Copies of this chain bind each other. A is one copy, B any other.
Amino acid sequence: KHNMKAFLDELKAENIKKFLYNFTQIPHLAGTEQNFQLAKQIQSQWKEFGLDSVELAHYDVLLSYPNKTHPNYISIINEDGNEIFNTSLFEPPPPGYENVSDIVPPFSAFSPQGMPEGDLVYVNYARTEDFFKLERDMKINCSGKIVIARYGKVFRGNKVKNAQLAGAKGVILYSDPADYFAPGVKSYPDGWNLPGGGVQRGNILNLNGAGDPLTPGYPANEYAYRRGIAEAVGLPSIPVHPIGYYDAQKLLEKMGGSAPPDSSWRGSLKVPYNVGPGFTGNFSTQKVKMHIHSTNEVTRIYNVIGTLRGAVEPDRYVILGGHRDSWVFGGIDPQSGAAVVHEIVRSFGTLKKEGWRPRRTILFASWDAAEFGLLGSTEWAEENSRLLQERGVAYINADSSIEGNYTLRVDCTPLMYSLVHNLTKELKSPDEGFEGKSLYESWTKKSPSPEFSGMPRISKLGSGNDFEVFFQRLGIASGRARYTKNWETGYPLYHSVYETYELVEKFYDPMFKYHLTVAQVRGGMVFELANSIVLPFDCRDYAVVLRKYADKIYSISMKHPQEMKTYSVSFDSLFSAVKNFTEIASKFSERLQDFSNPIVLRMMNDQLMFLERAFIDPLGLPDRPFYRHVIYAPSSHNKYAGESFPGIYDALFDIESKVDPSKAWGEVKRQIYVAAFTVQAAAETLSEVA
């Protein structure tokens, strides 16, 4: 037979290992020749694996690179103007790669140029809460200051956005060992920990889903008319540079001014963690000077797009996509995902060569420039938005297959919960102690649901990966899965030069069994979405979560009972809509269970496909036109995290500080109306059609 078991059995750990090795021997930075070379290899393959068509889709987008002959660095400068300490010009390369060409040194992508001189303030994680506390509680002024912040907890851009609106002037990001050095583990190359010379790269844009900063709304094709830099989307206005903890130590050791308010503000370095501003008297006259010469440049990028045409519904698309571009070698991010995609395509192609085709079309994508703002996936989705709107069944992401070796992690729409539960009950656990048990069993034991006994945790989609445009802008049901760490104990080498094939093969997954398990989950999800007669979505699972999210937003509002009395703020409409959704979804499920009348079947499959679509508001969220999903958006305080009912959540956020409470509570009421309406409208897509 050609069934899912045949597809799954064909996947091999040894192939994924080969690929990973194949994809990680040289750097594949977006917009470079090496990454174009890899795109052409993958295109070739995907063709030989058996796909019907494999094309490159190219765009010309804004990228950012250091100047090769004028390197970025940070100095401590005395009152004479002498530079008495310099941060590193590069991370010490890993063993055997100390002659690899074109390792681009650590930098913050899209930093402007500048050489700002000043005094440090230490802002902990640079979280919204961290800046409130500094200013409101400690009455500390970030204005005119160079802010030094440790990485962690939230997306770095959000840190930079936070630093900007606090008035800083120049920004230094560093990796504190408290956050990136696991206790009792050796640093690379002898273990998977971050050494003091390692540095986390990463872009610091705040794009809010726009994609290429010069062409918001439209693909960056060969006739595109571009915004000027001054009008670009999401660019930071102050210089920014990242460093490792050896260099941070040398910068922090002199901090004066106020003590840290508490132990949650102290990292692990042997320094005071004083918030500043400025140094201590001996060195009160020394300053910190940044030197940033990176340039933004419009550069061609290339997605590989493979098609396996469906036998019965070729105009319905199930998409498996993940990025290919890396900061350096990409041993985990993204090649541990890309190698899994490659083996998935190989397996589908083996079935295809035997005469099989999926019911629906499967599209496979190798996205470019994800590291510079999800640019490749976003421009492609902009180009193809009408086809994806009307034909897109689901998107399964495929960035890193691993970020630990403890258990499964799944983030997805509630419409895929039942699919994931059923699939994982049929897969073998790769975990020690669970041999002969299901993946569902190991996962449920290690990552219990907060809400239900005997079920596993499944998280919300936010942003920070290539599902963003599909889910949050277009409203196509999306999911992702990977192996993860035990959150009761990022990953330390994230976006550093030390992310290598050896890191994975020696320390994370020597037998490639976790990679294989992830391939079975991602590939199995794609198989069911593309082959099941009835789409494998359960609308009742959305009804359950919508009640949870309504309870939670109401609870936030109920912190302000006087104002809700004064401004007649009622959530009755939203609960009514959720109750209606629950009722209608229950009746739809009954019809689905007990309706070869392929029209009632295409009808009901279209109702399932367009249900995620119904949560889109074509007006977007306030000042964020490309975040259109009314139930989920990336948190306005952390792009990585999903927020439920974001429009109401943001309207309530810090509302007690708003100067005009009448206007502010009016806006909460407006967001309640929009959310209640959207939930009712989505519910009504599941009613009998006439």
Chain A residues engaging chain B, CB cutoff 8 angstroms: 52, 217-219, 221, 223-225, 307, 309-310, 312-315, 317, 361, 383-387, 390-391, 572-573, 598-599, 602-603, 606-607, 610, 613-614, 617-619, 625, 666, 669-670, 672-674, 676-677, 681-682, 684-685, 689-690
Contacts of A313 in B (CB 8 A): 599
Question: Is the Cβ of A309 less than 8 Å from the Cβ of B690?
Answer: yes
The answer to whether residues A685 and B613 also contact, given A218-B673, A619-B625 and a CB cut-off of 8 A, is no
Question: Is the Cβ of B573 less than 8 Å from the Cβ of A690?
Answer: no
Jot down 29 A-B pairs with beta carbons below 8 A, ordered by A: A52-B690, A217-B617, A217-B619, A218-B673, A219-B677, A223-B572, A224-B673, A225-B669, A225-B670, A307-B690, A310-B690, A313-B599, A314-B603, A314-B689, A315-B603, A315-B606, A315-B607, A315-B689, A361-B689, A384-B684, A386-B610, A386-B614, A386-B684, A387-B684, A390-B390, A390-B613, A598-B598, A599-B602, A602-B602
Query: How many copies altogether?
Result: 2
Most B Cβ at <10 Å: residue of A223, A312, A384, A685: A223
Which A-B residue pairs are the 3 nearest by beta carbons?
A315-B689, A223-B573, A309-B690
Q: How far apart are the CA atoms of A587 and B684 in the complex, in Å?
A: 37
Most B Cβ at <10 Å: residue of A384, A603, A689: A689
Q: How far apart are the CA atoms of A556 and B390 in the complex, in Å?
A: 35
Q: How far apart are the CA atoms of A583 and B690 in the complex, in Å?
A: 37
Q: How far apart are the CA atoms of A673 and B682 in the complex, in Å?
A: 34
Q: Nearest CB to that of A573 among chain B residues?
A: B223
Contacts of A684 in B (CB 8 A): 384, 386-387
Besides the contacts A315-B603, A390-B610, what 14 more A-B pairs have beta carbons closer than 8 Å?
A: A52-B690, A218-B673, A225-B673, A307-B690, A309-B690, A314-B689, A315-B606, A315-B689, A361-B689, A361-B690, A384-B684, A387-B685, A387-B689, A598-B598
Q: How far apart are the CA atoms of A673 and B685 in the complex, in Å?
A: 35
Question: Is the Cβ of A672 less than 8 Å from the Cβ of B386?
Answer: no
Q: Nearest CB to that of A620 among chain B residues?
A: B618
Question: Is the Cβ of A386 less than 8 Å from the Cβ of B681?
Answer: yes
Q: How far apart are the CA atoms of A43 and B677 in the complex, in Å?
A: 26
The answer to whether residues A666 and B225 also contact, given A673-B218, A685-B387, A689-B314 and a CB cut-off of 8 A, is yes
CB distance from A475 to the nearest CB of B (A): 10
Contacts of A390 in B (CB 8 A): 390, 606, 610, 613, 685
Question: Is the Cβ of A223 less than 8 Å from the Cβ of B690?
Answer: no
Contacts of A617 in B (CB 8 A): 217
Question: Is the Cβ of B613 less than 8 Å from the Cβ of A223?
Answer: no
Contacts of A674 in B (CB 8 A): 218
Question: Is the Cβ of B690 less than 8 Å from the Cβ of A315?
Answer: yes
CB distance from A585 to the nearest CB of B (A): 15
Contacts of A613 in B (CB 8 A): 386, 390
Contacts of A573 in B (CB 8 A): 223
The answer to whether residues A391 and B689 also contact, given A223-B673, A225-B673, A598-B598 and a CB cut-off of 8 A, is yes
Q: How far apart are the CA atoms of A310 and B688 in the complex, in Å?
A: 12
Contacts of A572 in B (CB 8 A): 223
Contacts of A677 in B (CB 8 A): 218-219, 221
Q: How far apart are the CA atoms of A685 and B390 in the complex, in Å?
A: 10
Q: How far apart are the CA atoms of A313 and B602 in the complex, in Å?
A: 10
Contacts of A689 in B (CB 8 A): 314-315, 361, 387, 391
Q: Nearest CB to that of A312 among chain B residues?
A: B599
Q: Nearest CB to that of A617 among chain B residues?
A: B217
Q: How far apart are the CA atoms of A450 and B676 in the complex, in Å?
A: 51
CB distance from A533 to the nearest CB of B (A): 13
Q: How far apart are the CA atoms of A685 and B388 in the complex, in Å?
A: 10
Question: Is the Cβ of A225 less than 8 Å from the Cβ of B391?
Answer: no
Q: Nearest CB to that of A671 among chain B residues?
A: B225
Contacts of A619 in B (CB 8 A): 217, 625
Most B Cβ at <10 Å: residue of A386, A672, A690: A690
Contacts of A317 in B (CB 8 A): 690
Q: How far apart are the CA atoms of A670 and B216 in the complex, in Å?
A: 12
Contacts of A384 in B (CB 8 A): 681, 684
A682: contacting residue among B221, B386, B603, B614, CB under 8 A: B386
Contacts of A314 in B (CB 8 A): 603, 689-690
Most B Cβ at <10 Å: residue of A218, A313, A607, A625: A218
Q: How far apart are the CA atoms of A685 and B315 in the complex, in Å?
A: 10
CB distance from A384 to the nearest CB of B (A): 8
Q: How far apart are the CA atoms of A317 and B676 in the complex, in Å?
A: 26
Q: How far apart are the CA atoms of A224 and B680 in the complex, in Å?
A: 13
Q: Nearest CB to that of A475 among chain B residues?
A: B386
Q: How far apart are the CA atoms of A684 and B599 in the complex, in Å?
A: 26
CB distance from A180 to the nearest CB of B (A): 41
Contacts of A315 in B (CB 8 A): 603, 606-607, 689-690
Most B Cβ at <10 Å: residue of A310, A618, A670, A685: A618
Question: Is the Cβ of B219 less than 8 Å from the Cβ of A672?
Answer: no
Q: How far apart are the CA atoms of A618 and B382 in the complex, in Å?
A: 11
CB distance from A596 to the nearest CB of B (A): 12
Q: Nearest CB to that of A227 among chain B residues?
A: B670
Q: How far apart are the CA atoms of A310 and B384 in the complex, in Å?
A: 32
The answer to whether residues A225 and B52 also contact, given A217-B619, A315-B603, A386-B681 and a CB cut-off of 8 A, is no
Q: How far apart are the CA atoms of A247 and B438 in the complex, in Å?
A: 89
Q: Nearest CB to that of A670 among chain B residues?
A: B225
Question: Is the Cβ of B225 less than 8 Å from the Cβ of A681?
Answer: no
Contacts of A361 in B (CB 8 A): 689-690
Q: How far apart are the CA atoms of A681 and B390 in the complex, in Å?
A: 13
Contacts of A610 in B (CB 8 A): 386, 390
Question: Is the Cβ of B599 less than 8 Å from the Cβ of A681?
Answer: no
Contacts of A607 in B (CB 8 A): 315
Q: How far apart are the CA atoms of A602 and B606 in the complex, in Å?
A: 12
